[PDB]
Fold:
Amino acid sequence: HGYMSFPIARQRRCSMESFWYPTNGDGITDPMCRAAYQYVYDKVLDETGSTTDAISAAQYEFQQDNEYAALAGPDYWDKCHITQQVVPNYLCAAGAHSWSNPFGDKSGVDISGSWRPTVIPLSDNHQVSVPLELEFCPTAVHEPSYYEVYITKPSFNVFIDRVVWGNLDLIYNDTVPLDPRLPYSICDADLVYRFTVPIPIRQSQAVLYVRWQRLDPVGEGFYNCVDINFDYNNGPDDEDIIVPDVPNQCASTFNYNEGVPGFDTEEYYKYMYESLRFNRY
Ligand SMILES: *[C@@H]1O[C@H](CO)[C@@H](O[C@@H]2O[C@H](CO)[C@@H](O[C@@H]3O[C@H](CO)[C@@H](O)[C@H](O)[C@@H]3O)[C@H](O)[C@H]2NC(C)=O)[C@H](O)[C@H]1NC(C)=O
Ligand SMILES: [Zn+2]
Structure:
């Protein structure tokens, strides 16, 4: 059992919110965490007609942040078994989408939208990959086990696409060492699974799908979605920097040509809404 602590798992970020009270989820500040709570709450309220069940199902989704799990059985290594029978859908819920069944309903966490990412700064804009030391926060030491990390394909759109096996690429597969936590770790466990993964860079928000799979007959696996984005450096690209190899003039602090219409002036914004008139109905 456990969850991704660095970058933080989507469901772990939600479980740090005040979801216990008020019971309708209005104490949850993050709009996507609040929508995930309210999705399961409204789903269960509409099927059973019981508010107590709606509250319990929605709370369970965030209380079980360390149990986003699925049982694969002895053939946990069989890719088609995982993709078609164990976690065929609702990947960020580890396939759990039924409140009265084992693992409940965590499908609110799998909805699309403006999930808040961990923003990773780039050291250099030509970096193809960023070696990032991932931290998995185990609430129990389960060995033998291994970790797989997937990343969404380059054109994945977090606002509208579901994370599915068809839009995920495997970037890491290894046994990871159980190590001491580094300073300022948000993991509440005493030891952690820390591992250096080369994360492919993206210009838009991506999702890492981390799978912690036990190698045993029961085959319990833990699956978490991790929202990430990349902060590019501003200015000209390093390869386009021509340096000079060889009267007193100064620029002022005056707002040059203030009042003249142009880019980012109110005229430009008003013009844009007229240019987008065919986009409104
Ligand atoms: C990540 O790496 C692990 C470790 O190499 C991969 O697990 C291994 O996967 C292979 C192929 O699915 C398994 O082989 C199969 O074993 C069964 C039983 O012995 C045999 O009947 C098959 O013919 C085949 O040889 C292998 O057992 C398994 N290893 C362990 C320790 O579980 C895993 O597939 C990799 N993940 C991805 C996404 O590729
Ligand atoms: Zn466990």
User: Anything to note?
Assistant: The pocket of zinc ion (ligand 2) is lined by residues 1, 140, 142 (CB under 6 Å). The chain has one domain: 1-281. The radius of gyration is 23 Å. Residues 31-48 form the longest helix (18 residues).
